[PDB]
From a paper:
The complex consists of six subunits (ORC1-6), with subunits ORC1-5 forming a partial ring capable of encircling DNA. All five subunits contain a winged-helix domain (WHD) and a AAA+ domain which consists of the RecA-fold and lid domains, although the ORC2 and ORC3 RecA-folds have diverged slightly and do not contain a lid domain. Adjacent ORC subunits associate in a double-layer arrangement through interfaces between the WHDs in one layer and the AAA+ domains in another with ATP-binding sites sandwiched between the ORC1·4, ORC4·5, and ORC5·3 AAA+ interfaces.
In contrast to ORCO2WH, ORCO1AAA consists of a dynamic ORC2 WHD that is unresolved in the refined map. The ORC1 AAA+ domain in this structure is ordered and forms the important interface with ORC4 with an ATP coordinated between the two subunits, an ATPase active conformation seen in previous ScORC and HsORC structures. In the ORCO1AAA structure, the ORC2 WHD undergoes conformational changes but does not change its overall position in the complex. ORCO1AAA was especially improved in this region due to the 3D focused refinement we applied. The homologous ORC4 region in HsORC is visible in the ORCO1AAA cryoEM density map allowing us to now model this region. Overall, the ORCO1AAA and ORCO2WH populations reveal a dynamic switch between the ORC1 AAA+ and ORC2 WHD where the locking into position of one domain within the ORC ring-shaped core kicks the other domain into a dynamic state.
Numbering used by the authors:
A (entry chain D): 17 to 142, 152 to 431
B (entry chain B): 239 to 248, 268 to 466
C (entry chain E): 5 to 85, 92 to 330, 349 to 433
D (entry chain A): 486 to 605, 614 to 663, 673 to 737, 744 to 860
E (entry chain C): 3 to 87, 97 to 158, 177 to 193, 212 to 501, 547 to 617, 624 to 637, 643 to 660, 672 to 708
The structure:
Amino acid sequence: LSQVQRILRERFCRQSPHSNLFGVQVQYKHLSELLKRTALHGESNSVLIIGPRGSGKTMLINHALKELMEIEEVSENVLQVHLNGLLQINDKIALKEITRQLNLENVVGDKVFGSFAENLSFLLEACPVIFILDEFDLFAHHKNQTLLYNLFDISQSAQTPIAVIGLTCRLDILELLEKRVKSRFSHRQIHLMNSFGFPQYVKIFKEQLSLPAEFPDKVFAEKWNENVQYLSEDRSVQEVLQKHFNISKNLRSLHMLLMLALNRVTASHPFMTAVDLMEASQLCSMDSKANIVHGLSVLEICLIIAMKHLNDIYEEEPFNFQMVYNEFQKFVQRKAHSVYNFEKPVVMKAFEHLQQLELIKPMERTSGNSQREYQLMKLLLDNTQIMNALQKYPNCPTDVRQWATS
Amino acid sequence: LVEEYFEAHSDQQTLRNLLSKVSPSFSAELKQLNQQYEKLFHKWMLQLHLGFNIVLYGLGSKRDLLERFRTTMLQDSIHVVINGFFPGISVKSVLNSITEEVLDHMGTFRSILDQLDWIVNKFKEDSSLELFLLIHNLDSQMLRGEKSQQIIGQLSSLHNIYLIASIDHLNAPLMWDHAKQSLFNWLWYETTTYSPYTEETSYENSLLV
Amino acid sequence: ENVVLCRESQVSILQSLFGERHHFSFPSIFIYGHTASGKTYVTQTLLKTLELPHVFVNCVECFTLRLLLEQILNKLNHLSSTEITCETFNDFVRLFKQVTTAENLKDQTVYIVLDKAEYLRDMEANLLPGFLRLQELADRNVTVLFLSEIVWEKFRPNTGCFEPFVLYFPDYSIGNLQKILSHDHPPEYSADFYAAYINILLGVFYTVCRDLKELRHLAVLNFPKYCEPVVKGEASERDTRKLWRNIEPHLKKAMQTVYLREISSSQWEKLQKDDTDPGQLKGLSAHTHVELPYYSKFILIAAYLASYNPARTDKRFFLKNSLLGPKPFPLDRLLAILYSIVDSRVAPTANIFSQITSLVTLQLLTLVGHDDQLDGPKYKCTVSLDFIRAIARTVNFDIIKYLYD
Amino acid sequence: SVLEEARLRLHVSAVPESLPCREQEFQDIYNFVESKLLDHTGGCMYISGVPGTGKTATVHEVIRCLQQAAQANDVPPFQYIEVNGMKLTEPHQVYVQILQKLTGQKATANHAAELLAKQFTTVLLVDELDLLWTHKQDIMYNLFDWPTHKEARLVVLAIANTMDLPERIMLTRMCFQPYTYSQLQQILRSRLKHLKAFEDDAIQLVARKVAALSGDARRCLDICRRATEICEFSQGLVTIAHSMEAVDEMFSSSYITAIKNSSVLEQSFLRAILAEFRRSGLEEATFQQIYSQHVALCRMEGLPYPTMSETMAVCSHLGSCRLLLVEPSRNDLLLRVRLNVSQDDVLYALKD
Amino acid sequence: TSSMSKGCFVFKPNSKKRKISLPIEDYFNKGKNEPEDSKLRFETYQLIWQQMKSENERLQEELNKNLFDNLIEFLQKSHSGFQKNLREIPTAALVLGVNVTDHDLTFGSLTEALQNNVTPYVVSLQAKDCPDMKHFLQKLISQLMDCTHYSMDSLSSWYMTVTQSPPVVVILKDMESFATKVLQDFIIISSQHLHEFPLILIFGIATSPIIIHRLLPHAVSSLLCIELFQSLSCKEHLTTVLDKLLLTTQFPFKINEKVLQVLTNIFLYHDFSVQNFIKGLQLSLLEHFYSQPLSVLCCNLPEAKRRINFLSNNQCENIRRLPSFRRYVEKQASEKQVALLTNERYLKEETQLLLENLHVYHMNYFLVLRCLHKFTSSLPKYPLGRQIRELYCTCLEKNIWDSEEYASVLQLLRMLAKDELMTILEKCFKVFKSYCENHLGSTAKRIEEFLAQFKFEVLRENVVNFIDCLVREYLLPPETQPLHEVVYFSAAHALREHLNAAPRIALHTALNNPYYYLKNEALKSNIAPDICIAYKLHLINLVDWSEAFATVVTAAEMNEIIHARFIRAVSELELLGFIKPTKQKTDHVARLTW
Ligand SMILES: Nc1ncnc2c1ncn2[C@@H]1O[C@H](COP(=O)(O)OP(=O)(O)OP(=O)(O)O)[C@@H](O)[C@H]1O
Ligand SMILES: Nc1ncnc2c1ncn2[C@@H]1O[C@H](COP(=O)(O)OP(=O)(O)OP(=O)(O)O)[C@@H](O)[C@H]1O
Ligand SMILES: [K+]
Ligand SMILES: [Mg+2]
Ligand SMILES: [Mg+2]
Ligand SMILES: [Mg+2]
């Protein structure tokens, strides 16, 4: 149905507010209490929310801010400023964004301020403000950390209530900061590590792929949820769920798998099947270098086998085109048969195509200093990738494979 | 001598200001090799105006001879004197010296190449300007760079600017090829005085005993 | 006009992922494949057919950030309907939210296809993660496509990013190539005649070439030679063996010449039009002869003996491998060799040193290291054995006697 | 209530009017300023220390008491100028500021520098000296040598974090030492003198841990307010248990709990790195060696055979969160990997 | 004034009213002989130099015409496709020589011809000001506009604005110097926009064309349509510029055999360059008009006789002391000696006769040289030389019949058949017809009589004796002629050291033999300056070296001055290219070893 696709595409792709909170109750208690304390009293605080990728940092701060804004007195008189470490790469850009988001762009006018903190103090004196700093580890790679010092200093000293929430992925975030800004940062840390096991992951699979209680057609929602409940207990589902849980505990990978699974649901196929999830798992788990080696010609495969022989005889030493061509000539003149005795320029063309795909990397990159041959290079394919991709080559000649084993 | 080659290959500096009681031995003999080279000044002044440039090679310090040259002839020109032996010298610095002092411009340029194009176009617009570039060392470690001499050669090729230079190093003909020795119309003049290096080697005495 | 052949699973997956207009698709798909596998063609025809608002941008042409962002903004403003200038990615996000809110573009998915996406990673660190997360930052229902030839593992930044859905466009096999090449028919002959021509062409060239573009260009070039027996009358359309006997030595000579671009395509067409024998010319290569002065010739011979010969054998050869590349030498060794091979007095004038540094600018030598300029003696001899042996034959000198025993 | 006023007194923004445990330093700085304000002469002073010592508070207290002295007609009236180095956008922006602080005129940097040179009763204070450094280094040397003239009649105070600063520049020197056990205890009991909100064993623990680790006052105030929050959850009196929870909530490193909570293949990758370091004996190893050990480890564990496009994702995930230190992934299979953490911490985290 | 803590000292003559400038040629009067004569000499120098420069540029624009015709044919044929209608970019690989300094002039000749025939939109780019793609494209667009962050779309917008049909042509002068990346990026960007921006590329190549394979891979060289072209040889342009600047009577200035040997050795051995040969002739002309006072007569012959009419009294005595004039009065009779020495008017008239005799000698000598060239060119095996310049040198150093090499040429010349001799006589009679105002009126009639006559051996030996007697009479060295010093230049050594110097020989001679520059008995086979004795001491641990230097300086001559002399004489030797410190010892280095 169309509405199922709409609601589930808004759930998985454009990551959307859903009521469920998974293993973050203590952390949400800490964050909600601190934000409510900043909003209703005059306390000024700093938090670093630390977690790996896709572990629910922005979900937690958006949910906490939504519940905080449900209070009417907070919603009347609390201002927010969002700043990302990707968009604002300088302190001038960030300061312009602070002036614009506080709706004081008309107020500041043509007035000139002697220092950055004079600009910020003029901003704040025209009612609490909450600062959210997405990609906090990029704000600490600036010149002298003017923004971090001037935010932590106003939080520690000035009367104006300010909360500085910073979302980061680095576990060493308290080693990039300067000593003086480390002093003014109250070391309140919220860690969203993924502390849940595999049966809880199966409940995650059930709870995300389920229609809400405000859905209009109730009988289709009921039979959809019963089909999902049945699909959670299927052993073929739990094998690929075990494989994806073994790779990572991230929920964003699960959402990618669920979107690839749900993509195969049409008017002809109303309900999800285990084969949909297995096909999605086969899509996600492809090996890229084997896919690239599958598309090569025969001559490039012979070049790669000659390179493998060079790396096996003269171990961990780079090579140029002349040694590779000498080994390939030792093939074509004696070992197998007369043809594939191609000339040097077409073999050089194949070698340059292997360089273009970045299956070969130069040992030293100096363009123009050296000619095309006599340039030392290294192979970026392991032996077992070569053997596995060679077994799956579409029409491989027998003598090339027999040369590769020997 | 490939024969000898193959075979062979197979005290503070503050004292030196006070300890300068050395007496040259051949004072009379070396006094005749300075006014010998004062004869060639008018030939140099003529050949500068016909589009040539002069490079001086020798054993001793040519700095006194160029300093004598400034006092003799160039007393009515907008001339600029460059010290290659100075530790903090750059081709960016000589370009600021020409732009800011001679032409009275007061601004900051985005790159050295844009400023070089601006000085070239300003000299091509007006031929009333005559400017002399004396460079005491052209082979020093700050000016050995190929891009700096590319800028200096593009400066020297115009018809209303002139250049005299001195080289000291043994392998100085390495640092110009056929494309760059077409920008400089060099006339090589041996001025082999025996004066010893005081100003140039005062910085050399810093990093040794 | 445009028809896609042997691309049916890929079109199915793309059209399924796009969904309806008001639906939300993936934030980022990364499409990878080989040098001609319908990356641009299938995507561009599929976005043109479904009438989806999309902007197709090449990253080689936009070599700065400002050019790329202004190209996207101007093309979107042309789709919606003077000049919008943005210097930073921040203003790009703000102006992109400004332009998308028009009545045509409020409730549909806008597509930003970026071709040759392996040039984005060289631009700046914050550009590629910003485009991977553009649906989250702008909140404007946006999908961004990345067409590339390099795999995704070479693209990941050190700090991580939002992961795209990675899709693979498979290679064309010999059956797919034969089906695609036999579609743009020459109308003056039959279908199976051109099919047999494509069959013998792929019989010759499939070992060394799997590229559809090069094979189609070769099929365009060699076709009048194939169909001149039926013009003259020696053969007919059903005489396949006569046609293949005519065409296969010509096809085995075209590989050495036109595929390597020694003889140009227009020259090849003129040779078969004028009936002149193929491979009767030198081409671009085999013109390896440069006219040098006398001392430049001995400087180059001295450098070639300095580079490819060890220093321990110097005194045995001159006073009284070819693999592994050149070996660097100092300037003093070069001058010692030069004074030892010339049987006359040579003065070390300024022009000989100017010759040594001018052979570097002609790429016949290369200085290595660049530690110092005047007191930097390091040089290499970057030229081959045949060029040096021809020069040594010109000055009447025996280079093989002095290279090795 | 009771803990609410504890949160009000314990806040860093509530600086006391009279500071405990820094009465000698106030007396020394006040006598150094009184020896130069009454006789109408000029001088320079440099102050240093680690950031928790209390320099800015004592300097502002000295300036406050001198302002009340001048208001009471004891000393001649004096203008106060304050410049902070970190708050400025550019290093030269001192010159446009001090002039604007001294006279009404606004100008460029160099022209304000010239008018400040020609101008030289004002008492300048320059906090955060380290950011006024330039490669030409005129700002530092000027800021010392203007007050040592007869026309200038200026007093310069300078604050920084390194005591060995004004020797590389080529001046009374003052050093603030970090607080000990008893001084930190005195500050914490001074803030809570009339309030029965804390047990003295908790104050004992917080003072002894902070005085052991760094020696800052802001850390004491933060740990005490966080322990107040933890005690507010368990509902009083802030016992030894709540401060013990706060001190290792704010002091412990979360590397071991990150390694323990990772997925199966990430722990197997770490075991492969350790096995490669045992076989080699170095501190770096290429991705090829680690993957060659990891295939064997996944074989004996019973896990399915790992692809390189999966092991590269595991390596990028571990290196992204700074458990490992890796090169950019643009070169691949030649990535030398080194552990960010010690091997003993890894074996402590993986054994359970 | 010349030393503070700054590396630049600008000086201005401001605040004083000396706005007037000093005119040129005041520096030419460094030796006072006559105040008026030197000005006339400088004007004669400027006039002759302008004539030689204009003749050189006319010669060079004449020679490159055929290659320009083929290239214009290629450009029109390649743009016929865009006139009809992805295609390849049409490129021409113009293989210039190794003679780099010539190329700029060639490109000037290449530009205006295209601007007259194919396109009005021609631009030239060099690699020195294109480090990256932004500078390459910014430099390209402005040269397009005169004939904001611009891109490739601005080029298409400008083209659509100005045309509303001709191509644009971009000449990249030097393939060796461009970066690989800007070439690859420019080709890839420009190829996909060929439908609305027609681009034709000429690649100026100095070496063989395989450098295209060196910079560009096969994936990018397949986007080009390369057709190869070749330019004129250096040798042919050299022989043409000597035949139209030295072997003509139109220019009065000539050079001696040794100066010509100097210039041909620095041409053939060091570098092919005709601009260096032109610079050598400019310096020869300059120093000849400097050193010689009576070189004012080296101009066109009526002006020369007009100058002979009006001279100063000292100039006549300067004429009298010429060595050729001295030998000329020695060989005459007794009364003519005092007639020439005493009276200066008879001197003026007699020198007026002698200049005209020299002028007709030059004309006869060049036409007989041109006639002998046909005989030696038709004859195989070329003993005297295959080129006119080799023949001119070997006849200029000495008469060719005194040498025994000419007898073998004559002996080979007797063994020819009829068709070759008919070809020789036709070419030589064409030579006589080509140069008008002949003073050899008899020989043209003689050779037309020999051509008219068609016992073959007797007429064959008759024509052999004819050309033999011709080169007896008129091939003659200029050193055996009166007043040749007026119009000849012989300063080989000074010209050689000004053009082609040797600094390492000078440094070695100064250090090893300081008596050569200080003739005060400083050396015959301890008494030396400090640098010259330290250099001979090392040709190297420092302490033993200092003891050896101290032993020598105390043998030759509580002070502690001599150790500072050692420090200065090692630091000075280190400022030159001799001493480099090394960590194996306190010092162990020998950078010369020669
Ligand atoms: N514990 C959880 N409870 C509910 N949803 C979760 C949880 N963990 C992850 N998610 C879901 O997974 C995704 C997590 O990514 P999110 O954007 O919230 O933060 P993030 O991706 O870690 O931040 P960043 O973009 O900086 O990496 C969201 O869609 C969220 O809905
Ligand atoms: N399935 C197909 N059906 C018809 N024509 C095709 C097909 N695939 C490719 N072509 C033709 O081959 C040409 C090259 O394909 P395309 O440009 O899509 O390759 P590409 O992968 O974009 O190349 P690159 O990797 O260089 O960007 C196209 O012009 C197209 O006309
Ligand atoms: K000049
Ligand atoms: Mg997030
Ligand atoms: Mg494409
Ligand atoms: Mg402070």
